[PDB]
Amino acid sequence: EVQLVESGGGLVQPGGSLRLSCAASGFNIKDTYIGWVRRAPGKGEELVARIYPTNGYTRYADSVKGRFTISADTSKNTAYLQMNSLRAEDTAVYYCYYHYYGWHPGYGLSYSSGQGTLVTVSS
Amino acid sequence: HEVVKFMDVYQRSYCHPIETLVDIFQEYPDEIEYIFKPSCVPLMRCGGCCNDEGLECVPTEESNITMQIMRIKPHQGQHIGEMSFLQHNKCECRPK
């Protein structure tokens, strides 16, 4: 049984910041890409950031390059997203997700995501 | 003979997401003793031209897609599993 426990969301003014965290249990994050996607009002899912904790290779949405920074602490089995210099367009629900790196055997769940944290950027 | 109009060629060839057949192993090159079936997957990926040697079409939005893929050790069996890839939701022309 996998759990993703999400925290860190809330309401800020432009230029403000939040730190999201996603504490996983039921699997090892070094085995996965772990990251965030976001869904904004009337838009499709978009990858925000991801990290392969086995080597710390990361990827970012073009729209957040230079502002957001993903990291992972493998001893806590937890990933973090530092969101700096927030804008109005960043307003979305952000979901923690993972999928097993490469090929995952069989019929069990290979990719999953959390409940979501709300991030609002207003005023 | 039915000649394709300029504007049509021009709009159709311009930078955008197009169904692209992507070799799996190039995306995930890690267990060299295994082969995948199919060996390639259909992914929306930026393609086309920018009509300026100084610009390249590049994704600016991306999303995950997850598929069932067989893995094969060549004289042993084939087994079903799952793999996840990036598609490109959005493309644009950007300095090289």
> In Å, what resolution does this model reach?
2.4
Residues A117 and A89: their CA atoms lie apart, in Å, by: 16
How would you class B92 by CB atoms within 10 Å of its CB: exposed for 0-12, middle for 13-18, buried for 19 or more? middle
Residues A106 and A100: their CA atoms lie apart, in Å, by: 12
The answer to whether residues A120 and A91 touch, using CB atoms and an 8 Å cutoff, is yes
Q: Domain ranges for chain A, please list them.
A: 1-123
The answer to whether residues A20 and A117 touch, using CB atoms and an 8 Å cutoff, is yes
Closest-CA residue to A111 (of A122, A123, A101): A101
> Is domain A1-123 given the CATH code 2.60.40.10 in the classification?
yes
Using a CB-CB cut-off of 8 Å, the residues of chain B touching A33 are 84
Residues A51 and A34: their CA atoms lie apart, in Å, by: 6
Token code pair at residue B94: 């950007």
Closest-CA residue to A82 (of A122, A3, A22): A22
**DSSP code of B12?**
H
Interface of B with A in 77-96 (CB under 8 A): 79-84, 86, 89
Residues A68 and A122: their CA atoms lie apart, in Å, by: 18
The one-letter code for the residue type at B81 is G
Using a CB-CB cut-off of 8 Å, the residues of chain B touching A63 are 60-61
Using a CB-CB cut-off of 8 Å, the residues of chain B touching A44 are 61, 63, 89
Q: Which of B28, B43, B57, B62 is the best residue to mutate to test the A interface, defined by the most A CB atoms within 10 Å of its own CB?
A: B62
Give the domains, in start order, of chain B with CATH numbers: 1-96 (2.10.90.10)
Task: Find all residues with CB under 8 Å of A25, minimum gap 6, and list them.
Answer: A2, A3, A5, A77
